[PDB]
C-alpha cells in the first residue's frame, strides 16, 4: 500500500516550484474544484500539509495534463449508462447531479427535487429535468488509501486523515490474516500493487515448490516463475512469497498464484484481529496507553522480522592496498573463532553487539568492521564482489562485501499500535494470560482500550466497526419465517445467512446503517455451549481476573482490526557511559549507532539556572563534556573510593582564548 501511494503521489514543491516560505497559506486549503481529482483527506501531517495530495480513485490524466473525471450525462431526465470524461472547465459549464440521489430502475428520478453542485460552492435543488450530468459512484473523491477505511462517513476530518496516514506505516507480520470488515477495494489494490505474481495464460499447474513454480500452458509451453524469499526490502523489512495453489489445478488466467508481504489469499492484510474491550482498567491504559494479553507474545500473533544490512570495502591507498584477511594483529583466537579462511564470518553464526563481523588489515593496523551498538541475530547471507571475477565496482575499490543480519522481533513493551480510525497508543503493560478479564464462557480478552478518549476525539466509527466485527465473527441468522423484518428490507438477499468467521465488506459512503446493526446484533448464532454472550446493545458481563468477582456493569467487546507501526522500541532505547570521543571537537559522538551521548540544549541550562543549581551545571558543562584531564581523573576517582576532584578549565574557553589572541587582542586573565 505504501508503494502504491508513493507511486500515485502528487507533489507540489521541489525544483521548478514554489518554496515553503514563499508559498502562500491559502494554497494549502481546499478548493471546490478538487472534488473528483485530488483527495481532500490524505495528506502528510508535517509542515508539508496541502502541498502533497493524491489522485482520486477514478481520475485519469488527459493527453495534455488536465485531470479528468468520469460522468454519465442525463439527456432528458433519464440516466445514461454510457459515460464520458470531463475536465474542470467543461465541468463548471454544466450541471452535475448527485450519485446518492435515489434513481428508479428504469432511469426515472423518483424525487422531483434533487440536490446538485453548481459553479462554485453553490448547491441548491432544481427540477428533475434540467439536470445534465450525474456522478458514477459515491467513492469518487477519496484517495486510494482512504478508500479502505470502513465507516469513513462517521469519523472526523482530522481523525480520518490520521488513520489514512497511519495505514501507510504497517509492518509485514509473519502470519497475516484478512480483515473481517473492510471495503471492497482491497483485492484490487493488491493485484495492481505488483507485489503479487499472477498467471498470464489459463493453464494447469504440474508441480509447485517453496522456491519456484511451474505452470503448463494449454498450448504446450512450460513456464517457470521464481519467487524471491527473504530479500531485504528497501526500508529494512522482509519480503517473501508463498504460493497458494495446489498440484493439479487448472488455474485460470489472471488468478493470483503467490501472496507477497501483507497479503492473505490475494488481498491486503496489514494486521490481525484482536478481541477488544472498552473500559478504564487500573490506569494502565491511562491517556492513550494500551494493555495486551501475553497470548499475543507467546503465539507470535504480532511477531515481525527485520533485516539489517552492513558493508565494508578495501580500497587502494597511496601507502598500499588493504586486504581482508582472517588473521589480524594481536587478537585472541576466541575473538576470531567465527571468521572463515577467506576472512569473513561463516553463514548461520550468532552475532552479539560488539562482536567482529569481518576482519581486515590496514598498512599493519586493525580496522575490522564490528556490529554496531544494539544489533543481534543470525547471519542469513553474505555477498562479496571481486574485481578478479570481472564485477563492476566503484572506481578505486577492489573488494566490497556486504553482510545481512536478520533478527526476529516479538512485540514487547513500548511499541506502537493503532487501528484504522487513527487511534494511536503504546503497550503500557503485558499482563499474564491468567490475569486478563474473561467472558462468561472463559474466553480471555486480548486488548483493553480506554473510553475517555473516544468521545473527546469523536471517532465513534470504531465502535460501530467493533460491533460489526463481533457480529461477523460470531455469525448471524436473521429470522425470515414470518417475513423479512422492516429493518431488513434493503439487505441483499444472500446476506441474511452467514457462517462463523464470515467475511463482510462495507463500501465507503454506502454501508450498513444503524438499524442494520441493531437488527443483526439481535440474531447472532449462540456459542457451542448453547448461550449467547453479548446483549442486543452489544455489551457483555465480564469477570475480573484479579478479584475474581464480576464487574457491576456490562462492557463492550468485539473484534477490531489492529496494525503495528514502525516506531519500535529497540531502535529508540540506548545508553552511554563512556566511549569513543570525537577528535576535532573533543566531544562525545552522537547517534545510537556511534554509541554517543545525548544532546543538552540551552533550555536545560535555563531550567538548571532557575532552580539555583550551580555545581550540577558546572559538571554538565565542564567535567563530562570537554575537560580531558577532568574526565580521566573523575573516572579514576570513581573506580577508586576517592572524592571527585573539582573540574578544571573547559577546552572551549582555552580554544576561545588561543583563537582571540590571534587577532592582536591581548586577552589577559587577571587572576588577581
Amino acid at each position: 500500500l505504501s508503494g502504491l501511494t508513493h507511486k500515485r503521489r502528487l507533489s507540489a514543491l521541489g525544483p521548478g516550484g514554489l518554496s515553503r516560505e514563499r508559498a502562500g497559506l491559502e494554497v494549502r486549503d481546499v478548493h471546490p474544484s478538487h472534488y473528483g481529482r485530488m483527495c481532500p483527506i490524505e495528506t502528510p501531517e508535517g509542515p508539508n500539509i496541502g502541498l502533497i495530495g493524491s489522485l482520486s480513485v477514478y481520475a485519469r490524466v488527459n493527453p495534455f495534463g488536465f485531470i479528468e473525471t468520469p460522468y454519465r450525462k442525463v439527456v432528458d431526465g433519464v440516466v445514461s449508462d454510457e459515460i464520458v470524461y470531463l475536465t474542470a472547465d467543461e465541468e463548471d459549464r454544466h450541471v452535475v447531479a448527485q450519485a446518492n440521489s435515489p434513481i428508479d430502475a428504469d432511469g426515472r428520478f423518483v424525487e422531483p427535487r434533487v440536490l446538485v453542485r453548481r459553479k462554485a460552492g453553490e448547491v441548491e435543488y432544481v427540477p428533475s429535468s434540467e439536470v445534465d450530468y450525474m456522478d458514477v459512484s459515491p467513492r469518487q473523491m477519496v484517495s486510494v488509501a482512504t478508500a479502505m477505511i470502513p465507516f469513513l462517513e462517521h469519523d472526523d476530518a482530522n481523525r480520518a486523515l490520521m488513520g489514512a496516514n497511519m495505514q501507510r506505516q504497517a509492518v509485514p507480520l509473519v502470519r497475516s490474516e484478512a480483515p473481517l470488515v473492510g471495503t471492497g477495494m482491497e483485492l484490487r489494490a493488491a493485484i495492481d500493487a505488483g507485489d503479487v505474481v499472477v498467471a498470464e495464460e489459463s493453464g494447469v499447474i504440474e508441480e509447485v515448490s517453496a522456491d519456484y513454480i511451474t505452470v503448463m500452458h494449454d498450448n504446450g509451453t512450460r513456464r517457470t516463475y521464481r519467487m524471491r524469499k527473504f530479500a531485504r526490502s528497501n526500508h529494512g523489512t522482509c519480503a517473501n512469497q508463498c504460493p497458494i495453489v495446489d498440484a493439479g489445478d487448472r488455474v485460470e488466467a489472471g488468478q493470483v498464484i503467490a501472496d507477497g508481504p501483507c497479503t492473505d489469499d490475494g488481498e491486503m492484510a496489514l494486521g490481525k484481529n484482536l478481541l477488544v474491550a472498552i473500559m478504564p482498567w487500573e490506569g494502565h491504559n491511562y491517556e492513550d496507553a494500551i494493555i495486551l494479553s501475553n497470548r499475543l507474545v507467546e503465539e507470535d500473533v504480532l511477531t515481525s522480522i527485520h533485516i539489517e544490512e552492513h558493508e565494508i570495502d578495501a580500497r587502494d591507498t597511496k601507502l598500499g592496498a588493504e586486504e581482508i584477511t582472517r588473521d589480524i594483529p594481536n587478537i585472541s583466537d576466541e575473538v576470531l573463532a567465527d571468521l572463515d579462511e577467506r576472512g569473513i564470518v561463516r553463514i548461520g553464526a550468532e552475532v552479539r553487539d560488539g562482536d567482529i563481523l569481518v576482519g581486515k588489515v590496514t598498512p599493519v593496523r586493525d580496522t575490522s568492521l564490528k556490529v554496531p551498538h544494539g544489533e543481534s541475530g543470525k547471519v542469513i547471507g553474505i555477498r562479496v564482489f571481486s574485481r578478479e571475477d570481472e564485477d563492476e565496482l566503484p572506481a578505486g575499490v577492489n573488494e566490497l562485501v556486504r553482510v545481512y543480519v536478520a533478527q526476529k522481533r516479538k512485540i514487547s513493551d513500548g511499541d506502537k499500535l493503532a487501528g484504522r480510525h487513527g487511534n494511536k497508543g503504546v503497550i503500557g503493560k503485558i499482563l499474564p494470560v491468567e490475569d486478563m478479564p474473561f467472558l462468561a464462557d472463559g474466553t480471555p480478552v486480548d486488548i483493553i482500550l480506554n473510553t475517555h478518549g473516544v468521545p473527546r476525539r469523536m471517532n465513534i466509527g470504531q465502535i460501530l466497526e467493533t460491533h460489526l466485527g463481533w457480529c461477523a465473527h460470531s455469525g448471524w441468522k436473521v429470522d425470515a419465517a414470518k417475513g423479512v423484518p422492516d429493518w431488513a428490507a434493503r439487505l441483499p438477499d444472500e446476506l441474511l445467512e452467514a457462517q462463523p468467521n464470515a467475511i463482510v465488506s462495507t463500501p465507503v459512503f454506502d454501508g450498513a446503517q444503524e438499524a442494520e446493526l441493531q437488527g443483526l446484533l439481535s440474531c447472532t448464532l449462540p456459542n457451542r455451549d448453547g448461550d449467547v454472550l453479548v446483549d442486543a446493545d452489544g455489551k457483555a458481563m465480564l469477570f475480573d481476573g484479579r478479584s475474581g468477582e464480576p464487574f457491576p456493569y456490562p462492557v463492550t467487546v468485539g473484534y477490531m482490526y489492529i496494525m503495528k507501526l514502525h516506531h519500535l522500541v529497540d531502535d529508540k532505547i540506548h545508553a552511554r557511559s563512556t566511549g569513543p570521543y570525537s577528535m576535532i571537537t573533543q566531544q562525545p559522538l552522537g547517534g545510537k549507532a556511534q554509541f554517543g551521548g545525548q544532546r543538552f540544549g540551552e533550555m536545560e541550562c535555563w531550567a538548571m539556572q532557575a532552580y539555583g543549581a550551580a555545581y550540577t551545571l558546572q559538571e554538565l558543562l565542564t567535567i563530562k563534556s570537554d575537560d580531558t584531564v577532568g574526565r580521566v581523573k573523575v573516572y579514576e576517582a570513581i573506580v577508586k573510593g576517592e572524592n571527585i576532584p573539582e573540574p578544571g578549565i573547559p577546552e572551549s574557553f582555552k580554544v576561545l582564548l588561543k583563537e582571540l589572541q590571534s587577532l592582536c587582542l591581548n586577552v589577559e586573565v587577571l587572576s588577581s
Binding site: I83, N100, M185, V256, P492, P507
Partner: peptide
C-alpha cells in the same frame, strides 16, 4: 461480480451498482 478469477468470496452491503470497474491503479 468478482472480476479477478479466484478471489475470496465476501458478500458486501451493496445498495448501488457502479457501472465501471476501477481503472488500472
Amino acid at each position: 461480480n468478482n472480476s479477478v478469477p479466484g478471489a475470496p468470496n465476501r458478500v458486501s452491503f451493496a445498495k448501488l451498482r457502479e457501472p465501471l470497474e476501477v481503472p488500472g491503479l
